[PDB]
Write a protein that holds these residues in place. Structure first.
Motif: not given
Lengths: 155, 41, 116
Positions: A49, B13, B16-20, B23-24, C30, C33
């Motif tokens: 990141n 979940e 929800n991990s892969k989205t983070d 997003t980055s 997905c 976001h």
């Protein structure tokens, strides 16, 4: 992102285990050109990141040279513009756990800081533009450094 | 994740991990595109 | 591979499309976001694209196909179990049809040894 003036990347260091994180310092080496109350803080990036820094290293004064310690995994040590030495922990970060005394620690800024890997509990060495090399003990910051050598030339 | 109510929640979940991670990688791509324009100017 | 459980719910042979749709609707979240460059979402962009809407039809279409192969060995199951229809009211009436004949009682019991 959105700092008061720009801050020059004064020194970089790699994570000893492998190329996963890169600790970097931030200070102005131009004299008196640093603004009054500029943001004094080193960051630590992760290669996954690279948007913003993974963890913050809040310091008393701007950090000139930092490096990772291969002996203790994630223990970054840094030399401030004041002359102060600081040591953080790369996991928790935030504020510095070991800080040298103001009076006995050398005048003018730490030009280089490196760890003495060849020791049980780690030790650190530090030079300056004052021209006084010093062999510090990380466990014991105590009353100043152990060794004091002034760099005479010629004899 | 390829390997009834339990199955679903574990998959959500994992998303929800892969989205983070995604997003980055959007803002990282923005910086890249915004650098191409800067380098030219 | 999707595991289901055959049984007699209210003594009627019965036994997913909601649970797999919950798995899908997260795949659409997905995009929400993702966030637009400009400064705002991509969910509007994906809802608009036909290919995505077409694939949602083929998912609901693929469950029917698997259910029908389940229906076959379900419908196959019901047929051997159909002889024992709900209520012993049947057996009480059949109890008088048999009447005296020993071989008849024996025969019907022999049938239930076979069903066993």
């Amino acid at each position: 992102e959105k700092e008061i003036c720009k801050r020059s990347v004064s020194e970089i260091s790699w994570h000893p285990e492998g190329p996963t994180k890169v600790a970097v310092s931030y200070a102005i080496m131009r004299f008196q050109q640093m603004p009054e109350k500029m943001p004094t803080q080193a960051y630590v990036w992760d290669l996954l990141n690279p948007n913003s820094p993974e963890i913050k290293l809040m310091s008393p004064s701007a950090v000139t040279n930092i490096s990772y310690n291969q002996k203790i995994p994630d223990q970054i040590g840094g030399g401030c513009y004041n002359g102060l030495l600081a040591v953080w922990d790369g996991r928790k970060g935030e504020n510095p756990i070991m800080i040298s005394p103001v009076e006995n620690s050398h005048y003018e800024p730490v030009t280089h800081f490196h760890w003495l890997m060849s020791k049980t509990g780690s030790e650190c060495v530090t030079t300056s533009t004052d021209g006084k090399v010093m062999w510090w003990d990380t466990r014991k910051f105590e009353a100043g450094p152990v060794e004091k050598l002034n760099i005479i030339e010629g004899l | 994740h390829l390997p009834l109510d339990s199955f679903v929640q574990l998959q959500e979940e994992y998303i929800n991990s892969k989205t983070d991670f995604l997003t980055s990688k959007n803002v990282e791509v923005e910086r890249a595109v915004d650098d191409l324009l800067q380098t030219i100017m | 591979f999707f595991q289901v459980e055959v049984q007699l719910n209210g003594d009627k042979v019965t036994l997913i499309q909601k649970s797999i749709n919950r798995a899908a609707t997260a795949v659409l979240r997905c995009s929400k976001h993702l966030y637009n460059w400009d400064q705002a979402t991509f969910y509007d962009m994906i809802a608009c694209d036909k290919e995505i809407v077409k694939v949602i039809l083929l998912l609901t279409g693929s469950i029917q196909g698997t259910k029908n192969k389940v229906n076959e060995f379900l419908s196959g199951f019901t047929k051997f179990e159909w002889l024992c229809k709900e209520s012993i009211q049947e057996s009480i009436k059949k109890f008088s049809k048999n009447g005296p004949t020993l071989q008849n009682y024996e025969d019907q019991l022999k049938k239930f040894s076979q069903i066993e």
